[PDB]
Design a protein around this ligand. Sequence first.
Ligand SMILES: *[C@H](c1[nH]c(/C=C2\NC(=O)C(CC)=C2C)c(C)c1CCC(=O)O)c1[nH]c(C[C@H]2NC(=O)C(C)=C2[C@@H](*)C)c(C)c1CCC(=O)O
Ligand SMILES: *[C@H](c1[nH]c(/C=C2\NC(=O)C(CC)=C2C)c(C)c1CCC(=O)O)c1[nH]c(C[C@H]2NC(=O)C(C)=C2[C@@H](*)C)c(C)c1CCC(=O)O
Ligand SMILES: [Cl-]
Ligand SMILES: [Cl-]
Ligand SMILES: [Cl-]
Ligand SMILES: [Mg+2]
Ligand SMILES: [Mg+2]
Ligand SMILES: [Mg+2]
Lengths: 150, 150
Amino acid sequence: SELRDRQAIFETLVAKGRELLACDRVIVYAFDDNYVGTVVAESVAEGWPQARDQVIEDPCFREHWVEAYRQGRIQATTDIFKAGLTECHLNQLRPLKVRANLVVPMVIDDQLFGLLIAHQASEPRQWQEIEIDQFSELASTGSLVLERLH
Amino acid sequence: SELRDRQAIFETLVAKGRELLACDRVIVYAFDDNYVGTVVAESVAEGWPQARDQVIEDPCFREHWVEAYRQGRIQATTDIFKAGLTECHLNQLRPLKVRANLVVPMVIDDQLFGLLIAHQASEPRQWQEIEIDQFSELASTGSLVLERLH
Ligand SMILES: *[C@H](c1[nH]c(/C=C2\NC(=O)C(CC)=C2C)c(C)c1CCC(=O)O)c1[nH]c(C[C@H]2NC(=O)C(C)=C2[C@@H](*)C)c(C)c1CCC(=O)O
Ligand SMILES: *[C@H](c1[nH]c(/C=C2\NC(=O)C(CC)=C2C)c(C)c1CCC(=O)O)c1[nH]c(C[C@H]2NC(=O)C(C)=C2[C@@H](*)C)c(C)c1CCC(=O)O
Ligand SMILES: [Cl-]
Ligand SMILES: [Cl-]
Ligand SMILES: [Cl-]
Ligand SMILES: [Mg+2]
Ligand SMILES: [Mg+2]
Ligand SMILES: [Mg+2]
């Protein structure tokens, strides 16, 4: 019954992450072999759309950033409307409602498994260094558990 | 599969915990029905004794501290030789070269499962508030995962 164990870990990570940051949504965004992402687990505050089990293909990861995320890159955005993003990027976030986000990597067996992502849905938010470090550690601990369970 | 699964999580906690604190040893100290402890997992720096698989019958947990640890007690000692401990207690720690320690509980299903314990052996160490927080959160994250792998 290993498959249900993996899902239980994903659910623990999103619930604990939303509690740590007191934000509107936390998701696990997992990659397939095309680096298309699926929202495999979600904790979301009542009143905002559920991204659970949506499939979002964003080519920037495979084209530009996979190796960087494997080496510990993050994305911290206080206000996505002031970040100089293209309409294509904004259009993919608009159905979910994202005003600020924090993106940290999940690396398992030296591969980029996915991203643990926090959203503030309607207000900007300056993420503080301690919040980034706690959220990164949560992702790193969860990834290591998954690596050792096989 | 249960025991092998649980062991994978214990091995993760001790490796991550020693990395976080840059200390000399981290162990999971697991209680049986009588609160006799077994060192079921260990991460230890080269050159120090291994506590792995040792059974330590220390009665203070069952007689005095079970309730306080269930309710979140954390114990941090900068120098065990200046803390007023008795010879009986110190003789448990002297073979392992312990000089400072940090003790946090693992509570699963509202029951004291065990303790996650960090040791400095090279010298005394004043544990800092941020380090205690990260170590306690590691124990909490690990406990929540074990709780959900029923
Ligand atoms: C790279 C990029 N995409 C994302 C995507 C997400 N943020 C989220 O919160 C979620 C969950 C819903 C997703 C998915 C991030 C965070 C980043 C930044 C990576 C980084 O710099 O660290 C990115 N994607 C686009 C989309 C755009 N590019 C295209 O080729 C096409 C087609 C697009 C529309 C679908 C853009 C503009 C970027 C940033 C620029 C770049 O790195 O190439
Ligand atoms: C309570 C006590 N024991 C421990 C044990 C350990 N610390 C470690 O680092 C390890 C791993 C090697 C172990 C095992 C701790 C941390 C504590 C303190 C609890 C707290 O304050 O939260 C304790 N045990 C003894 C042993 C002693 N008492 C006896 O009756 C007999 C017999 C003993 C010899 C085996 C003592 C003196 C204490 C502290 C005093 C007390 O709280 O009662
Ligand atoms: Cl939810
Ligand atoms: Cl609504
Ligand atoms: Cl108990
Ligand atoms: Mg199982
Ligand atoms: Mg650190
Ligand atoms: Mg007594």
